[PDB]
Amino acid sequence: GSHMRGPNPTAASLEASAGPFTVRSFTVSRPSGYGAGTVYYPTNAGGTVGAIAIVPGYTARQSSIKWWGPRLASHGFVVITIDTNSTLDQPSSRSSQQMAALRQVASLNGTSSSPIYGKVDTARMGVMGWSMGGGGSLISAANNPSLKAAAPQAPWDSSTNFSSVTVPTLIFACENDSIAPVNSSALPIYDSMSRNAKQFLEINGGSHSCANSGNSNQALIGKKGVAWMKRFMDNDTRYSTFACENPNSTAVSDFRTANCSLED
Hints:
Elements: H1 11-15, E1 23-27, E2 36-42, E3 49-55, H2 68-73, E4 78-83, H3 91-109, E5 120-129, H4 132-143, E6 149-150, E7 169-174, H5 186-192, E8 198-203, H6 218-233, H7 240-244, E9 252-258
Parallel strand pairs: 3-4, 3-5, 5-6, 7-8
Antiparallel strand pairs: 1-2, 2-4, 8-9
Protein name: Poly(ethylene terephthalate) hydrolase
GO molecular function, one term: acetylesterase activity
Family: Belongs to the AB hydrolase superfamily.
């Protein structure tokens, strides 16, 4: 049940700005169930790839999360970054919209005129997002346990009980977050998940925007995002160490992981 794409990874290849694949992108013409989207895809992945939908936070737009599009897509994923129907949509709505974005990627996969016709394995999907869009990604995972992976950043949700989530979940947290403080948001959410493979990666001295476009830790955060998606969406055990390891980075102020084997 593995779906391996690309060459055997190294720390260097995963820390680099781009993976091996050429990336192209397009705006979605008639978004269905969300405000706007950009689709990033590899032109040449050598097989179908999984799809990942990424949602910004309250007031925010695609620009905040855009860096993930090329970063992931270059490693062999189809990535859709969205704007929400309103910038003031709440976590539940962001989750519906995220899923709508995945549905619409599946639609384009079956549309002969689309640049992503036949490129997507619609059975292998993941979710990411910032703040309320991170809470939305956790809600998506709770409500859709067939998702293969979740990797929210600086998550915000008025509930921290995600105990039903069985989807492999990487929580990026920002140490000095004053919007969704770690000790009331990201850590309780992480500790609530008792049934899954999971990880907690807190970025040293990070503000609430520490994993957004233009951040100073794209080597480390990009490595870990891509590794987690590869291990869990692709069942690619070449990535078990990169996904599950303490990355031994001075950029990391707190590292925790459970049910995450280093074994390949």
